[PDB]
């Protein structure tokens, strides 16, 4: 569907194919996180501490269940019917995650029932009977510290130190909580928040949440990555201090007749000067139909391209005449700087600007020429079996393309200037050789 | 002043109105943070360490008291006159923060007189007596450290490991602390960097700074999370190593006749094709004069927008007709991909493209349909009680708008495609098409 | 429609290599379907094996029988076929060779729905 | 693996008896749940796919509906002469079958 060796000849040379993937069928599970360490071993050296601490965790935490209230005071079974005139204003997004938190409010009454079970845990990590066949976890934050560090140098140093000491780590722990659970956190009914952020609760250590979750696949790294393991936050208790999370965990689906395809871009020469094209790096496929793709949102790896949603985007007809044949649409940019790429390698076959850079063949000791007429060169074992740029020595093969390659002559396209500021400039000329033409 | 009916046909339904409030008048507290620990309690374990440890640092800390000297030296009372022909070049907010600085050293010089008080404190927070009635707190780096884990192994092992450890606490400090008090800090003379960032040099715990400090208030971390807590570096001390720090602490002030404007996109539907709007989400209105925004450095709340600074910029004739009732200059954009949402909720009214989802009446088993001359459908209780769309049923309120909304069509607006090198093939063709023209 | 034919020994000895190859009519094999493998032992109900896809390179398995499973295809023959290893006592069973139907559902996300419709005839392996 | 269960498990019946049963789940499929046709001996059948979508060629008077875990469905005027049915789910890999009720001779 693309034009790969008239593109070439404007420097931009085929790269690798992939894949496309997105993630859906997610499979839940529920777990608790306890934002307050129990004392009992330590009750002698804590001072005032924990009654401050409590009170300054409550005025964090009381407008989320707010807002969880109000979803949860207006839904009900007929399906369930949510009111509209109560909620008022929402987006789909927001009304089908107050679904998803109806449905989980079950398993959160029957996690409630074990609130003083959950209150009396003294490790980092507790498993819990929820019933004889199903069981919950308890991850308490700061556990570790008092356990292994505060508890065992009691009678070393003296009271006042160990309660000055829990003071630092507490507010420490607040101070990195506050980024993701304070005032930013205005809509805590969607479950589009990361796994990675969720665990800050615990520290950042979201590797032990998903191990003892039980979670186990062959994509585990890809779903981490892609920013694909959700979670939702389903009940707060604001006397016991913890939270009711629910784990979101996906597959990965592949798109059937679609691919991704990547350009490598080359400088090429005309008229006495060096030039790149503006044309973007990766072309979304699918059907025979072409578009753009947001990929900065995505995760790239040698054979897939694997994101959390559809992200393709539209693009101009001028733009889709380029990329099928018609070079003159091509946009190009003058270069001024000495970083930009000389050449490339494709399926063994080398193209360079030989007349940037030094281009010799090592099989004949002979110089390898470019015309003034010319924008690359393609080189193959036809003509040059191994070949010296610079410091590289290079073997190369057999091209699969017209023997002709370097005798024919391609059809430029018009300069651009891509800076932010030129914009506005080009704009304003334009509009006033408009009003002058008038 | 805006146009909500006539908008809400084009897929920009009505959201959520928020008040307007800026920082101001700010309230000032000053503080000492010294920035190398006291190791008189195992002063036979440390080797060679500070030594080395105190020549970096004072390398790092020298050209901050060099920049500082520049305004110190060239200020004095006549209010207070600055040396123009010394400074020679300087913004005006440079010159106000000198201005700043010079009120300041009066403290300092209270402060200072109390050297060798605080040479020697061995505790994380200390409190000293500055004057009878004025009070300075000390926060030392690495202290609870030093205090709490090697102070109390002290014969469970060996110098030489105390010493390596301490040597790789003072690396890891200095490795978090390089990028905001390194290179990158060029004018310290300004009082606009944030008490987040300040505290890098407290291992990042700047709620124990602001606690300690006594400031208190209902909308503290309003003020937080806007960035609006900030402050400026008064004196550097190269002997003892440590720094004096001046905190602002603001209040928010409302303005009286301004307000924000929310507005929640849907797809609509055009000629067998689905379309969604390119206007701005977030609209300003001071006085009945309409703005943009810069709203990504501003905190969102529930019921307000809260900025350290006044963020509103320009905009066109041509939007502002398009936002006050002129729907044929409001461009458009062609949806390719499956994630863009296709209905919204207001005031207890659905707005949605039934052409792409399924819509059904809960009440009498009946479909509801959507023509192809339409764009999208208003649903209400006159005509469906309860509304089934995929998953979701809805019970529904009534609409305060005009009775034959659905009868009624509206004038389009021309395409356009967003995308960046589609904004220069786009430049490029209209250019070429003007040259051609003439 | 599709038409298909399991083919392959009819009876094998215990822990020798098991080929099934499944001849596909009415149809290409590069359709934009799944072709699986489906075991029924006798005196037992229905168990998935795995599949490939037509249109690209790619495979799935059963967690159960993951290791001693190869799946593969040929579009010169329109034939696909699967290698079983280390054959036992309960490996007798009718082998059917199936397409499975797929449809995408978009609402705010994305679920897909996969059913059974279409099978093969059958035949039996005896260890 | 996503588990099913069903209620009842009984069905014996002769021409012109109605009956319901239903299917649960371990969690919520959405609709990824069938009910299927299985025929002795080779290639079996299928009824309801989709949860709500009758198949061709099957007697409209069979029906089913369902959300979240819990999915029923509804038959009448049975002719005994069919053999087996059951419900499935096609949500998460591998697929599996549930228990099943199915046409029995008394």
């Known amino acids: 569907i693309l034009h790969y060796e008239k593109l070439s000849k404007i420097g931009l040379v085929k790269g690798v194919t992939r894949k496309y993937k997105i993630k859906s069928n997610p499979l839940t599970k529920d777990i608790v996180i306890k934002m307050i360490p129990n004392v009992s071993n330590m009750s002698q050296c804590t001072g005032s501490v924990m009654e401050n601490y409590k009170t300054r965790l409550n005025g964090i935490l009381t407008p989320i269940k707010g807002a969880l209230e109000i979803y949860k005071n207006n839904t009900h079974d007929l399906g369930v019917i949510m009111a509209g005139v109560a909620i008022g204003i929402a987006t789909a997004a927001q009304i089908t995650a107050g679904v998803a938190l109806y449905e989980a409010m079950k398993n959160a009454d029957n996690i409630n029932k074990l609130k003083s079970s959950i209150e009396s845990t003294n490790e980092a990590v507790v498993k819990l009977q929820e019933t004889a066949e199903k069981t919950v976890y308890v991850l308490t934050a700061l556990q570790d510290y008092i356990n292994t560090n505060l508890v065992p140098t009691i009678d070393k140093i003296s009271c006042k130190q160990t309660e000055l000491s829990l003071d630092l780590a507490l507010s420490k722990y607040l101070s990195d909580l506050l980024f993701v659970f304070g005032p930013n956190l205005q809509d805590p009914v969607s479950n589009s928040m990361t796994i990675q952020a969720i665990s800050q609760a615990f520290g950042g250590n979201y590797e032990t949440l998903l191990r003892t979750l039980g979670y186990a696949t062959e994509d585990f790294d890809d779903l981490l990555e892609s920013d694909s393991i959700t979670g939702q936050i389903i009940y707060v208790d604001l006397s016991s201090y913890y939270i009711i999370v629910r784990v979101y965990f996906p597959i990965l689906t592949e798109i059937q007749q679609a691919y991704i395809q990547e350009l490598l871009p080359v400088s090429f020469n005309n008229d006495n000067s060096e030039w790149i094209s503006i044309v973007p790096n990766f072309i979304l496929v699918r059907n025979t139909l072409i578009s753009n793709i947001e990929i900065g949102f995505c995760l790239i790896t040698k054979r897939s391209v694997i994101c959390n949603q559809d992200y393709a985007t539209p693009m101009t007809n001028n733009m889709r005449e380029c990329l099928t044949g018609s070079t003159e649409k091509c946009p190009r940019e003058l270069v001024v700087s000495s970083h930009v790429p000389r050449f490339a390698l494709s399926n063994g076959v080398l193209f360079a600007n030989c007349i940037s850079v030094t281009c010799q063949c090592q099989t004949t000791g002979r110089a390898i020429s470019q015309s003034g007429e010319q924008t690359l060169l393609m080189i193959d074992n036809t003509t040059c079996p191994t070949a010296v740029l610079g410091n590289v020595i290079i073997s190369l093969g057999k091209y699969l393309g017209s023997v002709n390659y370097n005798s024919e002559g391609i059809a430029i396209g018009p300069p651009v200037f891509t800076d932010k500021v030129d914009i506005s400039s080009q704009i304003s000329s334009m509009n006033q050789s408009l009003q002058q033409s008038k | 002043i805006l146009h909500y009916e006539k908008l809400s046909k084009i897929g920009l339904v009505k959201g959520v109105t928020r008040k307007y409030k800026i920082k101001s008048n700010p309230l000032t507290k000053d503080i000492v943070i010294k920035m190398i620990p006291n190791v008189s309690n195992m002063s036979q374990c440390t080797g060679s360490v500070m030594e080395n440890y105190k020549t970096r640092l004072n390398g790092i800390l020298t050209p901050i008291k060099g920049a500082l000297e520049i305004y110190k030296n060239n200020t004095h009372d006549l209010g207070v006159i600055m040396a123009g022909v010394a400074i020679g070049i300087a913004t005006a907010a440079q010159i106000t923060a000198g201005v700043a600085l010079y009120e300041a050293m009066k403290n300092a010089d209270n402060i200072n007189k109390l050297k060798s008080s605080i040479e020697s404190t061995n505790e994380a927070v200390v409190k000293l007596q500055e004057t009878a009635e004025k009070t300075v707190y000390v926060l030392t780096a690495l202290q609870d450290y030093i205090n709490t884990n090697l102070v109390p192994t002290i014969d469970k092992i060996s110098c030489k490991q105390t010493e390596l450890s301490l040597d790789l606490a003072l690396s890891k400090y200095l490795s978090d602390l390089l990028f905001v008090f390194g290179p990158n800090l060029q004018d310290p003379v300004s009082n606009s960097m944030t008490i987040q960032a300040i505290s890098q040099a407290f291992g990042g715990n700047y709620e124990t700074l602001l606690r300690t400090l006594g400031y208190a208030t209902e909308d503290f971390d309003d003020l937080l999370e806007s960035d609006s807590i900030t402050g400026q570096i008064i004196y550097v001390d190269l002997s003892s190593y440590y720094i004096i720090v001046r905190v602002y602490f603001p209040i928010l002030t409302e303005i009286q006749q301004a307000y924000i404007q929310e507005l929640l996109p849907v797809s609509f539907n055009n000629d067998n094709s689905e379309w969604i709007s390119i206007v701005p989400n977030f609209i300003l209105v001071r006085n009945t004069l309409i703005s943009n925004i810069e709203i990504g450095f501003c905190l969102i709340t529930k019921r307000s927008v809260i900025c350290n600074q006044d963020y509103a910029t320009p905009m066109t004739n041509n939007m502002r007709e398009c936002l006050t009732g002129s729907t044929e200059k409001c461009p458009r954009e062609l949806v390719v991909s499956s994630h863009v949402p296709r209905f919204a909720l207001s005031n207890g009214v659905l707005f949605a493209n039934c052409i792409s989802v399924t819509c059904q009446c809960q009440t009498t088993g009946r479909a509801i349909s959507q023509s192809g001359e339409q764009t999208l459908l208003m649903i209400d209780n006159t005509t469906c009680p309860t509304a089934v769309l995929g998953n979701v049923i809805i019970s529904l309120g009534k609409y305060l708008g005009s009775v034959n909304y659905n009868s009624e069509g509206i004038a389009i607006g021309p395409p356009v495609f967003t995308d960046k090198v589609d904004i220069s093939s786009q430049i490029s063709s209209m250019n070429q098409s003007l040259q051609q023209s003439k | 429609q599709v038409q298909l034919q399991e083919s392959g020994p009819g009876v094998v000895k215990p822990s020798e290599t098991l080929s099934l190859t499944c001849a596909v009519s009415?149809?290409?094999?590069?359709?934009?379907?799944?072709w699986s493998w489906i075991r029924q032992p006798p005196g037992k109900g229905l168990e998935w094996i795995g599949y490939?896809?037509?249109?690209?390179?790619?495979?799935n398995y059963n967690p159960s029988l993951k290791s001693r499973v190869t799946i593969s295809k040929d579009t010169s023959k329109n034939q696909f076929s699967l290698n079983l290893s280390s054959l036992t006592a309960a490996d007798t069973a009718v082998y059917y060779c199936?397409?499975?139907?797929?449809?995408?559902?978009?609402?705010?996300?994305?679920?897909?729905?996969?059913?059974?419709?279409?099978w093969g005839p059958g035949v039996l392996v005896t260890v | 693996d996503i588990q099913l269960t069903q209620s009842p498990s009984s069905l014996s019946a002769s021409v012109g008896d109605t009956v319901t049963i239903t299917c649960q789940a371990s969690?919520?499929?959405?609709?990824?749940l069938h009910w299927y046709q299985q025929k002795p001996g080779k290639a079996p059948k299928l009824l309801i796919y989709?949860?709500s979508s009758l198949q061709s060629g099957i007697p409209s008077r069979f029906s089913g509906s369902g959300s979240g875990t819990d999915y029923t469905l509804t038959i009448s005027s049975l002719q005994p002469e069919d053999f087996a049915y059951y419900c499935?789910?096609?949500?998460?890999?591998?697929?599996?079958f549930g228990p099943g009720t199915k046409v029995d001779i008394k």
């Open positions: 199936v397409r499975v139907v797929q449809y995408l559902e978009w609402f705010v996300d994305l679920i897909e729905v996969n059913w059974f419709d279409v």
């Open positions: 989709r949860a």
């Open positions: 499935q789910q096609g949500y998460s890999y591998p697929f599996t």
């Open positions: 490939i896809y037509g249109s690209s390179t790619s495979t």
């Open positions: 009415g149809g290409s094999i590069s359709d934009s379907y799944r």
């Open positions: 969690q919520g499929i959405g609709n990824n």
